[PDB]
Amino acid sequence: DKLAVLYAEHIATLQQRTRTITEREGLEGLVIHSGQAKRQFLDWMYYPFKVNPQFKAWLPVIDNPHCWIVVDGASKPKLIFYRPVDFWHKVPDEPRDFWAEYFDIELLVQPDQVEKLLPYDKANYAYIGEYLEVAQALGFSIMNPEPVMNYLHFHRAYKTQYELECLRQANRIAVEGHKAARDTFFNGGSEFDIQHAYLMATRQSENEMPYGNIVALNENCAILGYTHFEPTAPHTHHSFLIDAGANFNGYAADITRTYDFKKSGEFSDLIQVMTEHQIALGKALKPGLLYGELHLECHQRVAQVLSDFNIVKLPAADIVERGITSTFFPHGLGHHLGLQVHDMGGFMADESGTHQAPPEGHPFLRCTRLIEKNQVFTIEPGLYFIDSLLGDLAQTDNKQFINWEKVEEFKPFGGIRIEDNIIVHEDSLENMTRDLHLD
Amino acid sequence: DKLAVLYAEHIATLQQRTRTITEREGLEGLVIHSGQAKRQFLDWMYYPFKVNPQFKAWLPVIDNPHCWIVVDGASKPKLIFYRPVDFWHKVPDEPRDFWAEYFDIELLVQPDQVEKLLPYDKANYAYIGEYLEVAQALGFSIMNPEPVMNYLHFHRAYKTQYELECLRQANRIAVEGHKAARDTFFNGGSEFDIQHAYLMATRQSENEMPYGNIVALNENCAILGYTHFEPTAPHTHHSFLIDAGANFNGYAADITRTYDFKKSGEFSDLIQVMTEHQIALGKALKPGLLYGELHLECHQRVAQVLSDFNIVKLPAADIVERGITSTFFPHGLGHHLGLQVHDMGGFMADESGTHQAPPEGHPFLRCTRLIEKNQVFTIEPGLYFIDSLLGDLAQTDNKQFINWEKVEEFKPFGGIRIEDNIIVHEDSLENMTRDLHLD
Ligand SMILES: [Mn+2]
Ligand SMILES: [Mn+2]
Ligand SMILES: [Mn+2]
Ligand SMILES: [Mn+2]
Ligand code: NA
């Protein structure tokens, strides 16, 4: 209903984007390939299918390989829809959902017979997809041209009302998962149990997740890319960091929360001060501001915490200026969110693809684009006690300034990250995560 | 330590097989590549890693890409082990498992630095792996040579004692899941509930499964390649079919069971009749017998059931000769089981790759090899009510012999498959599945 109505403006937006970039580049149209299933080496089984983001930008068809979109922004969008009729698969119903009527739909019963449906002379058609040797066999010469990709990726940061509603739906699902995971942690669950309570609440399997969930207990919290799920619980429950989202129509949620098992003590205090900073930074998104400036503020807030909690024996400014904050907060403040988890265009200054430079002391900041309305952001400040980086810091002049006893007291708890998904509007902010009352 | 004792003989067998085909094909050795992580098109996320079956044939390292085995059958096997050292990665300590003492281990810190650790002259070295341009760029000319592949695949049918013990462990894990899945079905749970009850009892996540589980309710049991997990339970529970396994050290279980929600009725009797036929088919495994003959016997037995239940109003011999039996049982009786679900060499007559011809009226039969000691088989007779196959039958000159009223009563139950994993010994058969008291 609501989604069906908004979808028309979504097709209109993408039609106008196609017309603009195709005509600017002298192309008669785009051919966007959903992708193919990858077969495993020496085996008959396939890897799980992952749709081309450029394909699902047009319609919520994320589980169908060998599908093709032909668009020029002037004709009605043309869709080749893979629909095999083998007896060992449930034949799917011909496309009858809200997006069907916005396309002229040709059914494809076998992947290799796709050349009849594609354009005969395709010298002025750009193939957008991963399978370049399949494209060359079909007769395409232009493949993923950089001006077309950079244009599309740049305007991906401006979500249509259909996309906004999809991102809201994804946050509603993910938030239900986060609540069930929290409860499982406080009842003494293992990482594996917490993870599968999450999926049971989301009604989405491991491979439907938009990214590999991070479900960490105790010192695993300090491991940023922790992917394992330990099946047996730890003997003592201290902390819990879950980074997990959900999918809706190809769009992603991306939520992180950190919990203290005792819900009191110095680590519990650390979560709450970090929560204050996270809420404040999340309220600092505003059109016309460079995202890197929020990353700057975040480091100052982390330094204030390090100073106030006696983690570093320095006032806040010194901890920022000597670069010690990046030992405890080593990643960017956040990124754009949408069809991809770390969405496209976050580092661009213009639609040609020029990079927007990061701030002076953070050359690895990846999201530096100017904030505008209709853009969706993550805000994920963190403070971690990472053995590896603490080791680096002990080999510097800064070794004298860190309270090594107090850091040993926090190492069992690992670290903290608190992440929301916020829509930036013309004169307001919409925090999708906290409007669903997670906390 | 039981498993570690058997592993020494395993490596002696692998060393000897390597030396045989290596010198027969005039190679100085093999270079077996574990694989790489496949990155998502225009993303930073990756696909779940799946190890090269030839790599894990040597060792139970199934979650590490960029690993290399250099083996010639005479020298101590060399293992280049990928151990990256990054702050966001969990640094695991140097390999200290039961298999480590059997390899000269060199640590690989960055994937592209492997050029130094491989043999300098690669003229007579064969690369076994998927990433052929990576091999060409390292200097390999010999790649997955067919004489080597056919030899190694042929002899994978003869499991070592280490391999038989791993297969028993896989079955034990899977049987626990099958008990949990069954209990959730009788609780009225959804397909999604059952699947995740299975994962939780086995304490393995969806991607650690050796294949995509088939968890089907009611009509979905008739769909042989069903992968969906419906999150909403059906209003009426009639039937449940689950085909699922588990991993142990790279070796797979593969167990199928069918259940009737009421523990009574004609479908319940059909399951029970099919069960006794499945037990008799499984007890017909015998050294010196062609596996195709059991597939013929299976078709004979399914015709018996179709006649006995008045699905087809014909003597069983006339059901077989007229070919009606494939409409209800369209796949093979089973396959070899091991490192891969449908394991290698089940089509071969000799170690050079020569195919063993399938039986008369079954040219697509995949498993045909001569049964011998130390081989592992599945026995999966089936009986299904498949719309598109039943439609084709309704348009043949046998249509008057089919009891369409009874077939219509069976359609909401879908179908039946019962699958066990059986080791063939010299003087006995070891039904791993039924030895675990699953029923
Ligand atoms: Mn994020
Ligand atoms: Mn996240
Ligand atoms: Mn099987
Ligand atoms: Mn099976
Ligand atoms: Na042996």
Short mmCIF file of C-alpha atoms in Angstrom, two decimals, chain A:
data_model
loop_
_atom_site.label_atom_id
_atom_site.label_comp_id
_atom_site.label_asym_id
_atom_site.label_seq_id
_atom_site.Cartn_x
_atom_site.Cartn_y
_atom_site.Cartn_z
CA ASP A 1 0.00 0.00 0.00
CA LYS A 2 2.10 2.91 1.21
CA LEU A 3 5.16 1.23 -0.33
CA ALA A 4 3.35 0.64 -3.63
CA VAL A 5 2.44 4.32 -3.88
CA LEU A 6 5.92 5.64 -3.09
CA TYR A 7 7.42 3.24 -5.64
CA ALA A 8 6.13 5.30 -8.57
CA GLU A 9 8.19 8.31 -7.48
CA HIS A 10 11.10 5.87 -7.09
CA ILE A 11 10.81 4.70 -10.70
CA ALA A 12 10.44 8.34 -11.77
CA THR A 13 13.60 9.35 -9.90
CA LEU A 14 15.63 6.47 -11.34
CA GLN A 15 14.20 7.06 -14.82
CA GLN A 16 15.35 10.68 -14.70
CA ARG A 17 18.77 9.63 -13.41
CA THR A 18 19.11 7.11 -16.25
CA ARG A 19 18.10 9.65 -18.97
CA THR A 20 20.54 12.22 -17.57
CA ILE A 21 23.62 9.93 -17.54
CA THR A 22 22.85 7.90 -20.64
CA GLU A 23 22.37 10.98 -22.83
CA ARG A 24 25.35 12.74 -21.24
CA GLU A 25 27.52 9.73 -22.14
CA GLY A 26 26.00 9.04 -25.56
CA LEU A 27 24.48 5.71 -24.52
CA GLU A 28 21.22 4.31 -25.88
CA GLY A 29 20.58 2.54 -22.58
CA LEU A 30 21.84 0.47 -19.68
CA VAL A 31 21.71 -3.30 -19.30
CA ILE A 32 21.81 -4.16 -15.59
CA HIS A 33 22.55 -7.80 -14.73
CA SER A 34 21.27 -9.20 -11.44
CA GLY A 35 24.13 -11.71 -11.43
CA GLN A 36 24.53 -15.47 -11.37
CA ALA A 37 24.83 -18.23 -8.82
CA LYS A 38 28.45 -19.24 -8.24
CA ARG A 39 29.13 -22.98 -8.30
CA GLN A 40 31.56 -24.39 -5.77
CA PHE A 41 34.87 -25.84 -6.94
CA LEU A 42 34.58 -29.48 -8.09
CA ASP A 43 31.04 -29.56 -6.67
CA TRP A 44 27.42 -29.30 -7.77
CA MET A 45 26.42 -26.96 -4.92
CA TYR A 46 26.32 -23.18 -5.21
CA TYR A 47 27.40 -20.30 -3.04
CA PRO A 48 24.47 -18.25 -1.71
CA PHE A 49 23.24 -15.75 -4.29
CA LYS A 50 24.10 -12.06 -3.78
CA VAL A 51 22.26 -9.64 -6.07
CA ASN A 52 23.99 -6.85 -7.97
CA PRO A 53 23.26 -3.64 -6.00
CA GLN A 54 22.66 -1.74 -9.25
CA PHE A 55 19.98 -4.29 -10.15
CA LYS A 56 18.06 -4.25 -6.86
CA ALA A 57 18.22 -0.44 -6.88
CA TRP A 58 15.29 -0.72 -9.32
CA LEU A 59 13.06 -3.38 -7.73
CA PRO A 60 12.96 -5.67 -4.64
CA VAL A 61 14.11 -8.80 -6.49
CA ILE A 62 17.15 -9.99 -4.54
CA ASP A 63 16.97 -13.80 -4.87
CA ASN A 64 16.73 -14.23 -8.66
CA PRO A 65 19.86 -14.70 -10.80
CA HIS A 66 19.96 -14.31 -14.59
CA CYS A 67 17.63 -11.30 -14.54
CA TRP A 68 18.24 -8.27 -16.75
CA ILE A 69 17.01 -4.67 -16.75
CA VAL A 70 17.07 -2.53 -19.92
CA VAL A 71 16.57 1.17 -19.19
CA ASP A 72 17.23 4.41 -21.05
CA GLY A 73 15.13 6.78 -18.93
CA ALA A 74 12.80 7.51 -21.87
CA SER A 75 11.02 4.17 -22.43
CA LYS A 76 9.24 2.05 -19.87
CA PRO A 77 11.71 -0.04 -17.82
CA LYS A 78 12.24 -3.44 -19.43
CA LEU A 79 12.79 -6.52 -17.26
CA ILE A 80 13.93 -9.99 -18.27
CA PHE A 81 12.75 -12.18 -15.39
CA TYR A 82 14.29 -15.60 -14.80
CA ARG A 83 11.50 -18.15 -14.25
CA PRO A 84 12.61 -21.77 -14.69
CA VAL A 85 9.92 -24.46 -14.88
CA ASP A 86 11.94 -27.55 -13.80
CA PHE A 87 9.97 -30.10 -11.76
CA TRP A 88 12.39 -30.00 -8.79
CA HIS A 89 11.62 -26.35 -8.06
CA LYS A 90 8.37 -24.71 -7.03
CA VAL A 91 7.47 -22.68 -10.09
CA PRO A 92 7.22 -19.07 -8.91
CA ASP A 93 4.15 -17.06 -9.85
CA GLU A 94 4.50 -14.65 -12.70
CA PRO A 95 5.47 -11.24 -11.24
CA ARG A 96 2.27 -9.86 -9.67
CA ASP A 97 3.56 -7.56 -6.89
CA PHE A 98 3.48 -3.76 -6.71
CA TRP A 99 6.58 -3.34 -8.89
CA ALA A 100 5.40 -5.61 -11.72
CA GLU A 101 3.30 -3.01 -13.66
CA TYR A 102 6.24 -0.55 -13.81
CA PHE A 103 8.10 -2.96 -16.14
CA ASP A 104 7.56 -4.70 -19.44
CA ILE A 105 8.32 -8.25 -18.33
CA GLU A 106 9.80 -10.97 -20.53
CA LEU A 107 10.09 -14.35 -18.83
CA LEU A 108 13.36 -16.26 -19.22
CA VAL A 109 13.05 -20.04 -18.91
CA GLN A 110 16.76 -20.85 -19.34
CA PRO A 111 19.77 -18.60 -18.63
CA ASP A 112 21.74 -19.19 -21.87
CA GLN A 113 18.79 -18.21 -24.11
CA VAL A 114 18.92 -14.58 -22.90
CA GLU A 115 20.36 -13.16 -26.14
CA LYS A 116 16.97 -13.10 -27.89
CA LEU A 117 15.61 -10.63 -25.28
CA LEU A 118 18.63 -8.31 -25.33
CA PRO A 119 19.16 -5.58 -27.94
CA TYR A 120 20.62 -6.79 -31.31
CA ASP A 121 22.94 -3.87 -31.80
CA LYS A 122 24.44 -3.09 -28.38
CA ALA A 123 27.42 -0.92 -29.30
CA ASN A 124 25.74 1.99 -27.47
CA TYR A 125 24.61 -0.03 -24.43
CA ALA A 126 26.55 -0.22 -21.17
CA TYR A 127 26.59 -3.52 -19.31
CA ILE A 128 26.29 -3.01 -15.54
CA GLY A 129 27.23 -6.25 -13.83
CA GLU A 130 29.94 -8.55 -12.56
CA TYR A 131 30.12 -11.19 -15.32
CA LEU A 132 32.24 -9.45 -17.94
CA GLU A 133 33.09 -12.59 -19.92
CA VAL A 134 29.38 -13.44 -20.15
CA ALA A 135 28.76 -9.87 -21.34
CA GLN A 136 31.53 -10.05 -23.95
CA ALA A 137 30.11 -13.33 -25.25
CA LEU A 138 26.71 -11.68 -25.67
CA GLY A 139 28.28 -8.78 -27.58
CA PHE A 140 28.73 -5.93 -25.12
CA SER A 141 31.76 -3.64 -25.46
CA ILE A 142 31.03 -1.01 -22.79
CA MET A 143 31.11 -2.59 -19.32
CA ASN A 144 30.77 -0.75 -16.00
CA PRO A 145 31.93 2.61 -17.46
CA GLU A 146 33.37 4.74 -14.67
CA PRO A 147 31.33 7.92 -15.46
CA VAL A 148 28.07 5.95 -15.23
CA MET A 149 29.04 4.16 -12.01
CA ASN A 150 30.29 7.32 -10.30
CA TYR A 151 27.12 9.21 -11.25
CA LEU A 152 24.79 6.46 -10.03
CA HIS A 153 26.83 5.91 -6.86
CA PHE A 154 26.82 9.64 -6.10
CA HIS A 155 23.04 10.03 -6.37
CA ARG A 156 22.54 6.82 -4.39
CA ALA A 157 23.14 8.96 -1.30
CA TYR A 158 19.82 10.74 -1.97
CA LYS A 159 17.17 8.18 -1.06
CA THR A 160 13.67 8.39 -2.51
CA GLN A 161 10.64 8.16 -0.23
CA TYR A 162 10.31 4.49 -1.22
CA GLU A 163 13.88 3.83 -0.08
CA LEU A 164 13.36 5.71 3.20
CA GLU A 165 10.31 3.58 4.02
CA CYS A 166 12.27 0.43 3.15
CA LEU A 167 15.07 1.43 5.53
CA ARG A 168 12.48 2.07 8.27
CA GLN A 169 10.99 -1.40 7.76
CA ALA A 170 14.47 -2.94 8.03
CA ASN A 171 15.16 -1.13 11.31
CA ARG A 172 11.86 -2.34 12.76
CA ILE A 173 12.85 -5.94 12.00
CA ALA A 174 16.42 -5.55 13.28
CA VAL A 175 15.26 -3.85 16.49
CA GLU A 176 13.07 -6.86 17.30
CA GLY A 177 16.15 -9.04 16.83
CA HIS A 178 18.27 -6.85 19.09
CA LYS A 179 15.71 -7.10 21.89
CA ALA A 180 15.68 -10.91 21.77
CA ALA A 181 19.48 -11.05 21.68
CA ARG A 182 19.72 -8.75 24.71
CA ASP A 183 17.35 -10.95 26.73
CA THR A 184 19.30 -14.07 25.74
CA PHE A 185 22.53 -12.48 26.98
CA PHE A 186 21.09 -11.59 30.39
CA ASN A 187 19.88 -15.18 30.80
CA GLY A 188 23.44 -16.44 30.31
CA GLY A 189 23.35 -17.42 26.65
CA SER A 190 26.38 -18.21 24.55
CA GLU A 191 27.34 -16.22 21.46
CA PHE A 192 25.85 -18.97 19.28
CA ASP A 193 22.60 -18.94 21.25
CA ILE A 194 22.34 -15.14 21.14
CA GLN A 195 22.91 -15.16 17.38
CA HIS A 196 20.17 -17.68 16.70
CA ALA A 197 17.74 -15.97 19.06
CA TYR A 198 18.41 -12.91 16.91
CA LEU A 199 17.54 -14.76 13.69
CA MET A 200 14.48 -16.40 15.29
CA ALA A 201 13.17 -12.95 16.21
CA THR A 202 13.98 -11.37 12.83
CA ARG A 203 12.50 -14.34 10.91
CA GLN A 204 15.57 -14.09 8.66
CA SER A 205 18.29 -16.67 8.16
CA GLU A 206 22.05 -16.14 8.35
CA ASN A 207 22.32 -15.51 4.61
CA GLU A 208 19.43 -13.00 4.54
CA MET A 209 21.38 -10.79 6.95
CA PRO A 210 22.93 -7.85 5.04
CA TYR A 211 26.27 -8.54 6.75
CA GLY A 212 27.88 -11.11 9.02
CA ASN A 213 26.49 -10.41 12.49
CA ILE A 214 29.01 -9.56 15.21
CA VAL A 215 27.90 -11.31 18.42
CA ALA A 216 30.66 -10.99 21.02
CA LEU A 217 30.86 -11.76 24.74
CA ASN A 218 33.49 -10.44 27.18
CA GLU A 219 36.92 -9.73 25.60
CA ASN A 220 35.69 -10.77 22.14
CA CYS A 221 33.99 -7.32 22.25
CA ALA A 222 37.46 -5.80 21.62
CA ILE A 223 37.70 -7.72 18.32
CA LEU A 224 36.19 -5.42 15.72
CA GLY A 225 35.78 -8.05 13.00
CA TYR A 226 34.81 -10.89 15.33
CA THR A 227 32.80 -13.35 13.23
CA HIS A 228 32.86 -16.68 15.13
CA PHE A 229 30.02 -17.70 17.46
CA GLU A 230 31.30 -19.72 20.41
CA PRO A 231 28.75 -22.49 21.08
CA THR A 232 29.48 -22.83 24.81
CA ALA A 233 28.90 -19.92 27.16
CA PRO A 234 31.82 -18.31 29.00
CA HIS A 235 32.15 -19.21 32.65
CA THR A 236 31.62 -15.56 33.68
CA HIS A 237 29.34 -13.16 31.80
CA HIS A 238 30.73 -9.61 31.71
CA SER A 239 29.81 -7.73 28.51
CA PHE A 240 27.95 -8.18 25.24
CA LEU A 241 28.39 -6.37 21.92
CA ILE A 242 25.98 -7.25 19.11
CA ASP A 243 26.32 -5.62 15.69
CA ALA A 244 23.47 -6.91 13.53
CA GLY A 245 20.82 -5.63 11.15
CA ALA A 246 18.15 -6.94 8.79
CA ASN A 247 16.99 -6.80 5.18
CA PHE A 248 13.87 -5.26 3.67
CA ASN A 249 13.47 -5.18 -0.12
CA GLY A 250 17.26 -5.11 -0.47
CA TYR A 251 17.82 -2.32 2.07
CA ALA A 252 19.81 -2.77 5.25
CA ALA A 253 19.63 -1.94 8.92
CA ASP A 254 22.90 -1.64 10.85
CA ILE A 255 22.54 -1.46 14.64
CA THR A 256 25.06 -1.98 17.45
CA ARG A 257 24.51 -2.14 21.21
CA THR A 258 26.83 -2.88 24.14
CA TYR A 259 25.57 -4.29 27.45
CA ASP A 260 26.98 -4.85 30.93
CA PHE A 261 25.83 -8.07 32.60
CA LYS A 262 25.89 -6.78 36.18
CA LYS A 263 24.34 -3.46 34.95
CA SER A 264 26.46 -1.62 37.50
CA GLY A 265 30.13 -0.87 37.97
CA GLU A 266 32.68 1.17 36.07
CA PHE A 267 32.09 -0.54 32.71
CA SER A 268 28.35 0.08 33.06
CA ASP A 269 29.22 3.73 33.68
CA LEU A 270 31.39 3.70 30.55
CA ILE A 271 28.48 2.52 28.41
CA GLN A 272 26.25 5.32 29.68
CA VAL A 273 28.74 8.14 29.10
CA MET A 274 29.36 6.69 25.63
CA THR A 275 25.59 6.61 25.15
CA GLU A 276 25.43 10.35 25.91
CA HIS A 277 28.11 11.06 23.30
CA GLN A 278 26.39 8.77 20.78
CA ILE A 279 23.04 10.52 21.23
CA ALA A 280 24.71 13.94 21.00
CA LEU A 281 26.71 13.09 17.88
CA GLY A 282 23.59 11.52 16.37
CA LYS A 283 21.78 14.82 16.91
CA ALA A 284 24.62 16.74 15.23
CA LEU A 285 23.87 15.60 11.68
CA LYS A 286 22.76 18.67 9.78
CA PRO A 287 22.61 19.62 6.08
CA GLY A 288 25.57 21.65 4.89
CA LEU A 289 28.03 20.06 7.34
CA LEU A 290 30.93 17.84 6.32
CA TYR A 291 30.60 14.41 7.93
CA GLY A 292 34.29 14.45 8.85
CA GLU A 293 33.61 17.25 11.33
CA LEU A 294 31.42 14.86 13.33
CA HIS A 295 34.26 12.33 13.30
CA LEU A 296 36.46 15.07 14.77
CA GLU A 297 33.97 15.80 17.55
CA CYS A 298 33.72 12.06 18.27
CA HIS A 299 37.45 11.81 19.02
CA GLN A 300 37.19 14.72 21.46
CA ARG A 301 34.30 13.01 23.23
CA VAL A 302 36.27 9.75 23.44
CA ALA A 303 39.21 11.70 24.88
CA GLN A 304 36.93 13.25 27.50
CA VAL A 305 35.89 9.74 28.55
CA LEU A 306 39.47 8.43 28.59
CA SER A 307 40.46 11.41 30.74
CA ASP A 308 37.50 11.35 33.12
CA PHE A 309 37.64 7.59 33.74
CA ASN A 310 41.39 7.68 34.48
CA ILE A 311 42.20 5.51 31.46
CA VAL A 312 44.71 8.09 30.19
CA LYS A 313 46.48 10.41 32.67
CA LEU A 314 45.99 13.49 30.50
CA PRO A 315 43.38 16.19 29.92
CA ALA A 316 41.13 15.63 26.94
CA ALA A 317 42.79 17.97 24.44
CA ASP A 318 46.23 16.38 24.85
CA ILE A 319 44.75 12.92 24.20
CA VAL A 320 43.28 14.24 20.93
CA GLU A 321 46.37 16.15 19.84
CA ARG A 322 48.87 13.38 20.58
CA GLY A 323 46.68 10.95 18.62
CA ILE A 324 45.96 8.53 21.46
CA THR A 325 42.19 8.51 20.85
CA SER A 326 42.68 6.45 17.68
CA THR A 327 44.17 3.63 19.78
CA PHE A 328 40.82 3.30 21.59
CA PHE A 329 38.55 4.44 18.72
CA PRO A 330 40.32 3.18 15.58
CA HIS A 331 37.50 3.27 12.99
CA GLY A 332 35.38 5.91 11.33
CA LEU A 333 32.39 7.41 13.08
CA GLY A 334 30.01 5.91 10.53
CA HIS A 335 28.92 5.75 6.92
CA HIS A 336 26.00 5.95 4.54
CA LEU A 337 23.34 3.25 4.70
CA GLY A 338 21.02 1.89 2.03
CA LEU A 339 21.13 -0.84 -0.60
CA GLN A 340 24.67 -1.64 0.62
CA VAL A 341 25.65 -1.59 4.31
CA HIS A 342 28.62 0.72 3.70
CA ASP A 343 26.70 2.50 0.96
CA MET A 344 28.04 4.23 -2.14
CA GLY A 345 29.00 7.86 -2.63
CA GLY A 346 30.11 8.55 0.95
CA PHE A 347 33.53 9.79 -0.17
CA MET A 348 32.51 11.84 -3.19
CA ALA A 349 32.44 15.61 -3.58
CA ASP A 350 30.64 15.74 -6.96
CA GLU A 351 28.77 13.40 -9.29
CA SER A 352 31.81 12.90 -11.54
CA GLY A 353 33.46 10.98 -8.70
CA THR A 354 35.99 13.43 -7.23
CA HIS A 355 36.96 12.46 -3.70
CA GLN A 356 36.06 14.78 -0.83
CA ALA A 357 39.23 15.02 1.24
CA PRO A 358 39.09 13.68 4.82
CA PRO A 359 40.13 15.76 7.84
CA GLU A 360 43.79 16.43 8.38
CA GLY A 361 44.64 13.76 10.94
CA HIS A 362 42.28 11.02 9.72
CA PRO A 363 43.37 10.17 6.16
CA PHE A 364 41.60 6.79 6.38
CA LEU A 365 38.17 8.27 7.11
CA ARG A 366 36.06 6.82 4.30
CA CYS A 367 32.82 8.84 4.67
CA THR A 368 33.59 12.55 4.15
CA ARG A 369 30.81 13.78 1.90
CA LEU A 370 28.76 16.89 2.67
CA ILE A 371 25.60 16.09 4.63
CA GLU A 372 22.33 16.86 2.83
CA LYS A 373 18.65 16.06 3.17
CA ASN A 374 17.36 12.59 2.23
CA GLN A 375 20.67 10.92 3.18
CA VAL A 376 20.82 8.07 5.71
CA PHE A 377 23.75 7.64 8.09
CA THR A 378 25.12 5.38 10.76
CA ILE A 379 26.56 6.92 13.93
CA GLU A 380 28.69 4.33 15.75
CA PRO A 381 31.15 5.80 18.27
CA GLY A 382 33.28 3.26 20.07
CA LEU A 383 35.87 2.76 22.79
CA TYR A 384 37.79 -0.51 22.80
CA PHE A 385 40.64 -2.13 24.72
CA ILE A 386 42.41 -3.89 21.85
CA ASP A 387 45.43 -5.94 22.93
CA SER A 388 47.14 -5.44 19.57
CA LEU A 389 46.89 -1.65 19.49
CA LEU A 390 47.63 -1.24 23.20
CA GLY A 391 50.84 -3.10 22.37
CA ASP A 392 51.70 -0.57 19.66
CA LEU A 393 51.08 2.32 22.10
CA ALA A 394 53.37 0.79 24.71
CA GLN A 395 56.26 1.15 22.21
CA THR A 396 55.73 4.92 21.84
CA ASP A 397 56.54 7.98 23.93
CA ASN A 398 52.88 7.95 25.05
CA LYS A 399 53.46 4.81 27.17
CA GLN A 400 53.95 6.92 30.30
CA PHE A 401 50.52 8.55 30.02
CA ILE A 402 48.25 5.47 30.15
CA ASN A 403 46.93 3.92 33.36
CA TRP A 404 47.87 0.34 32.54
CA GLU A 405 46.23 -1.05 35.68
CA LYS A 406 42.87 0.53 34.80
CA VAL A 407 43.14 -0.86 31.26
CA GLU A 408 43.77 -4.35 32.66
CA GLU A 409 40.59 -3.93 34.70
CA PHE A 410 38.58 -3.26 31.51
CA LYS A 411 40.15 -5.90 29.23
CA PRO A 412 37.68 -8.63 30.35
CA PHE A 413 34.88 -6.36 29.10
CA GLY A 414 36.45 -5.81 25.68
CA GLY A 415 34.94 -2.64 24.30
CA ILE A 416 31.87 -0.59 23.43
CA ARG A 417 30.07 0.47 20.27
CA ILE A 418 26.64 2.10 20.02
CA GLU A 419 25.17 2.53 16.54
CA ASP A 420 21.97 4.13 15.24
CA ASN A 421 20.51 4.64 11.77
CA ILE A 422 19.39 8.23 11.21
CA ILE A 423 17.59 9.88 8.29
CA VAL A 424 18.56 13.50 7.66
CA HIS A 425 15.60 15.65 6.60
CA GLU A 426 15.43 19.29 5.52
CA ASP A 427 14.80 20.67 9.03
CA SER A 428 14.67 17.58 11.28
CA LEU A 429 16.37 14.26 12.00
CA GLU A 430 14.67 10.85 12.11
CA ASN A 431 16.52 8.34 14.30
CA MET A 432 14.91 5.13 13.06
CA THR A 433 16.64 3.02 15.71
CA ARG A 434 15.52 4.99 18.77
CA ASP A 435 12.04 5.81 17.47
CA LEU A 436 11.35 2.06 17.77
CA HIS A 437 12.31 2.30 21.47
CA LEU A 438 15.17 -0.19 21.58
CA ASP A 439 16.43 1.37 24.81
#
